């Protein structure tokens, strides 16, 4: 009976005019130059077998020629082959795949597939249609089997910098139909994979060394990471959620991208921040310190600020009334002639970027031109006038705040500083980037964690400080093309989405235009896909 | 939660199946037999969705049902007998702790000493500790059953 | 199985009383007056394989006998032979039409297709049922095949002018029907072409080489045309949607047809307005200027009206009345002696089309007996008095408003002034005429440009304005019988929509008694289609 | 036509399956067909490079035709040479082909690889093949990698006897495929490759023929003016990479700003602002969408500026928009610094102000400290007087931003700029050979170029040093016109100044790339 399928079964064999023998005679011929192929036991269960890849959604909306499902050639693209390359230096051959279409008798619609070469753009103007291609019905009920040739410009394929590979593309070739019309609008197709014939690997290698250019960022991002041990890079608070933002933002301080490079001036980690000169004075007073942008010469990261220095926007405050979601940490004054630190001053200051402050401080977004100010936002003991004189002040922070109300997410987008020459990370098409939230203490109130009447505050970071630490250590360069991005499936009891990351670092989200917090206290696990082009919508089935 | 049955070998059966399908479960072991009173190692069959159920015509129609059945297979054997009333070193199972007179007028509820009648629920959610007992035989509260 | 189509599979080979042994012998024996043939290779891919030539809808609401699909025999039904067309300067041979018909067990109708000899008019009026013929059923699963050969009375088809060729007609030969009513009320049809094996070129010639029939109209509306690069041609605007106009309308100024002709008195572009001869008085002041429309002796074009004139009709007023709708542009007065401007004069006027202008201004839309008028709508600093004083105006104008508030669009189609001879558009069946629609500046709020809270204000214009340019440049009158569209189907990232153009020179979409506008922000791009009857209703899948 | 190494280069390429167009009898194999052609003067010494082309379909009408339609191409093409010299000339020119990995540039010594010779004289062309050494296995279409080239450079230097007016020769350049040339793997005929499409069809007869317009002043294209001191031009300007230095788009509209400075302390309105404060435009923060070029002219009195950008339009209220109807006049605009209390002009962008000045009086002026300017974009030229001026603007108007490259001459060749008719205050109704003379402008580039500029990146079509020339045939003569990678156009003027007419421009047909150091040719 066709209603049940084996797990070996390939069901339909179907052919392009890319599978000939020229291309697998000449792949196992070329491959020869690193020795004879191993792992080539074809009775092993791991190569016989089909198992489980991606699951996508076919929507009667979706117009012909609209891409619904794409995947570039790699061994990453099976458990096992995966698994196996730890400890070889390279590969070679193709890999077959298996469709499962879930429809019924009454529906109707058809699909299209092809394989595309090497060196050719996948996006929305790719015309599927113009290729060799097969054509798959709706109601089909035996699965479809596929196969992808190794169609390379080299002899064999380098484990860390594989080359020029082709990819496989699915689309629609006429809408899908339902008789009935009514409230039933969509079907599901599923994808497995396993080797073909001439897949092979050469020259075995120590499982502890190290490639030249990593393979991929996968590993950077795994479950504890959201789900309770990972830590903002701006906060350093529990991240608890995944804040959308439909305008547009940027970040340079403590953000790394996969060139292994940074804009600020802060190390992936949090600890005291000390500058040895600056100007202090009170014209229960409130101290001021300040000094010139620029002239970190302690630093050896930036020029621009002593490490750790918080890249948010000083608001102003005097008089009574203290100041409005900003920057709060812990410290005093030092005297910089022996280091002994002046015992009267210790108090909680706000600090921030502004320009003019000895005449008119107002805050300022850019680094040049600006100055560092902090302003304990209590009275202190005794105050100090002196000429040269150190700060000290810790990494991890909290949110000033007039009363025990609580205010929206801190900081806002235009209220971050940023050097000249940053990337901007702004939407492509319905993908946001997005922020992750972590509950940050306030000082109107000093005893709420989450569930509390008076509010909940947070605190968003762009990046978790896992992966900054990640990518600071290694070198990514070779994984993304200009225009992709690399893809995780966050699975929940009820509902998954897609997580994607870009070449400057930041993180994506198929939210739309909505601005609602998403919650992660109900996430299972996350699992990696890979390199998917930037045009596609990710996936959001909350 | 976390398991991904469908990376494993496995078997594909489509909603409009008229014929039974029937599985072999083996007896996959460390051990050179169970002891009924504790067992050891053993292994798991799991029944999971691979693709969404579809009514085409909507409705109030939303669910099917599928029946289970099962025969030893011809490997499967019994050894050493033992005396009818004996107990295990496992524990008994639970299944033994509410039968059918329980609830049917004969058994009473742990707070008044009443004849339960009937079921509410709570979505709201709730917590007891007096005479209520957990699974591990320990209570948290100030008084015997 | 019957689910699965391969690239090679011709699947049903339907047949008519046309396609005989005899006919292809001569045309490979005849051909030989051009020499040997070229591109005949059997093995080669781009012959082997079908590829996607076009689309069409089958609804319940087509009548027996309706066209929905018809062709021209010729090399541009298929992409590669449309490609290689380039460059050879003969042709001849057959070629085949795959359909793949979208549908389902539960539907039912039938459609009809015939091979129509050449030297037989195609139009309404032709009943392709009493010609040989092939029935097709609407529930087929397998796709079915259908050669047309080439009967032709020559030796051979120079590419520069073919001659007489035969044309393939797909119609209705019996309603489609659903049994359950409701929403669905359509399917779709599939179209593939490959090659026949009689089929062949000769004669190369050079690449850039022109041909003695015109080149074809599809290269004037790419796809930067509509996507913020093109601008209209009446308010020189950035067009940004179309805009149906169900009632109809008509147009002449700055308009040409598909025979390299205008009516009206304007060159496709925009520079100043100038008129040597006119009145001018003022009896701060509102300063009244006007001539006798049939005098523009400069204007080698027309006599009707200078260069860059606007044709709407004037709105009268006097005093505190700023009037509703206007053209406006900037200028001033000057002294026709010796060509120095008025100094006082300069201020924003109003122009348009007039009768009785002196004594009782009234508005009117035909330029034989009418005055042409400007009045200032502002107080200049000086007014003159001269019996003959000349006009100079900017003609990249805006629209008069009182208040902050948006009006409608403008002009609506009763203020359009028409020389006499200038056809119309109306309504064909379901198809509509359009207009092109950008955003205007408007004196009530001059920095509102789009997404105001005040309103957006949207101008309107009969043709692009690079359309224009390229129809006045060329003769397209053997591309396009009368009774006929060219097609250019618009794909946009969800839906689709086809649009057509006439021998007259105006647009239109199948948009029915709708008169909404279309955005034009989501269009990804333009791909051409080619002629169509005009009584076949084009598609409008938005 | 054969190769040394075609049995390897078959058997390799089979990794994209069978080879595809191989007939080895199609018409468009078998002739040679025209490829381009360059310049050899007296003045380049030995081993200087006259023509280098890297391996590619590229070089063959029919090739390039058949690649827009195949993934892949693999083997090796024939070249052939045809100089157009005299029997009184002399001097010898050598060709070699260099294997990837080796530096090319002058002085190299083409003359210690295998070569052929060519001489000055010769009337029976010259053939050389060049096979395909690559390391991979093919070449995909879109990404080729490291493929060999073909170098041309001086053996002994041309001379000339009679000493007159001949100072340089012509060859032209032949091509076709060998023998084990191949194409692989069909591809969708709209798909888009990495590699850069080439400029040829940027530059076509109607541009200059009477649809064209300048990139200045939206007028159209009447002739061609040379520049033989340089210049530089920034705003409304694009390179061959698909950037612009100044803060303005390829279209003509009106010139809008929200905050300014506005007094007149029958008056003259005065408005200013600060440079580097234009928070809407996303283009640049220097100057409003559209805002002149140029440098300010001041006036004050019954003066009347000269040589000066002119727009009509007024000032407007920030509050709700509506505009102030009694200031509705001719204004100049301009950069200047010290505005308030010294007006003086600057060519600079950094620490200027935008300026405009009202040149009539307006029906009534307006004081306030915050206001708003509206202008229409296409402007006219200030005069004081009927008679007409020198071409507007002179190089030492141009207002630049830091960082922008200048244009110098090159040998003979110097850079252009394209001029159209603009009307001028004065006689407002002259237009083109009236009596009182004809006004013109100036501009940088034809609109057309830019907007396919700005819409496409041609990176790799132009490496740099190198033209791109078109011929320009007239009805008695003929002109050749260079562009480079900088956006800027050249011709062989050399140190002539007069103005060049369009009028009876009959054809414009592309030539090919170039070095910029050979002679472009000027024959009118």
């Known amino acids: 009976p066709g209603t049940t399928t084996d797990g070996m079964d390939p069901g339909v064999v179907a052919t392009t005019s890319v599978v000939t023998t020229e291309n697998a005679s000449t792949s196992i011929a070329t491959a020869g130059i690193g020795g004879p192929p191993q792992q080539m036991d074809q009775q092993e269960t791991w190569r016989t077998n089909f198992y489980y890849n991606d699951v996508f959604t076919w929507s009667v909306a979706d117009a012909p020629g609209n891409i619904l499902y794409t995947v570039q050639h790699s061994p990453q693209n099976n458990p096992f082959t995966a698994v196996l390359s730890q400890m070889y230096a390279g590969w070679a051959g193709g890999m077959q795949f298996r469709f499962i279409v879930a429809g019924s008798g009454v529906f109707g619609g058809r699909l299209v597939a092809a394989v595309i070469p090497p060196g050719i753009e996948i996006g929305p103007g790719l015309e599927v249609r113009q290729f060799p291609h097969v054509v798959i019905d709706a109601r089909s009920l035996e699965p479809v089997t596929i196969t992808m040739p190794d169609l390379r410009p080299n002899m064999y394929h380098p484990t860390g910098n594989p080359g020029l590979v082709p990819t496989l593309v699915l689309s629609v070739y006429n809408n899908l139909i339902n008789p009935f019309g009514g409230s039933t609008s969509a079907i599901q197709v599923t994808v497995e994979t396993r080797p073909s014939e001439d897949f092979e690997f050469v020259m075995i290698r120590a499982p502890s060394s190290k490639t030249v250019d990593s393979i991929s960022p996968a590993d950077l991002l795994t479950t504890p990471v959201l789900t309770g041990v990972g830590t903002d890079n701006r906060w350093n608070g529990e991240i608890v959620g995944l804040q959308p933002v439909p305008g547009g933002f940027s970040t340079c ?6 060139n292994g490079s940074t804009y600020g001036w802060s190390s992936p980690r949090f600890a005291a921040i000390d500058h040895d000169r600056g100007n202090a004075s009170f014209p229960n007073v409130l101290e001021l310190w300040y000094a010139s942008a620029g002239s970190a010469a302690d630093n050896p990261i930036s020029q621009i600020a002593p490490d750790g220095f918080p890249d948010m926007s000083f608001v102003p405050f005097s008089g009574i009334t203290i100041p409005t979601a900003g920057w709060v940490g812990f410290g005093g004054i030092w005297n910089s002639s022996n280091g002994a630190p002046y015992v009267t001053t210790m108090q909680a200051y706000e600090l921030g970027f502004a320009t003019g402050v000895p005449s008119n401080p107002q805050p300022t977004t850019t680094t040049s031109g ?3 100010v902090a302003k304990s936002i209590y009275g202190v003991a005794n105050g ?9 002040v810790m990494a ?7 009363n025990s109300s609580a205010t929206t997410y801190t900081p806002q987008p235009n209220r971050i500083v940023n050097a000249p020459g940053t990337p901007a990370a702004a939407p492509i098409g319905k993908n946001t980037p997005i922020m992750f939230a972590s509950v940050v203490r306030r000082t109107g109130d000093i005893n709420a964690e989450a569930g509390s009447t008076n509010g909940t505050q947070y605190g ?20 993304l093309m200009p225009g992709q991005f690399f893809v995780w499936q966050l699975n929940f009891a009820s509902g998954f989405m897609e997580l994607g990351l870009s070449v400057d670092g930041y993180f994506y989200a198929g939210t739309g235009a909505s601005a609602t917090l998403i919650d992660l206290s109900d996430l299972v696990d996350i699992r990696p896909v890979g390199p998917r082009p930037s045009t596609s919508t990710l996936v959001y089935n909350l």
Chains 1, 3 share one sequence.
């Open 384 to 392: 100090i006038n002196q000429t040269t004189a150190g700060l000290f």
């Open 253 to 258: 301080n403590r953000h790394w991208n996969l």
């Open 396 to 402: 991890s922070g909290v949110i000033s705040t007039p």
């Open 370 to 372: 600006a100055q560092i």
């Open 460 to 479: 968003a970071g762009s990046q978790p400080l896992p992966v900054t630490i990640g990518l600071s250590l290694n070198n990514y360069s070779s994984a």
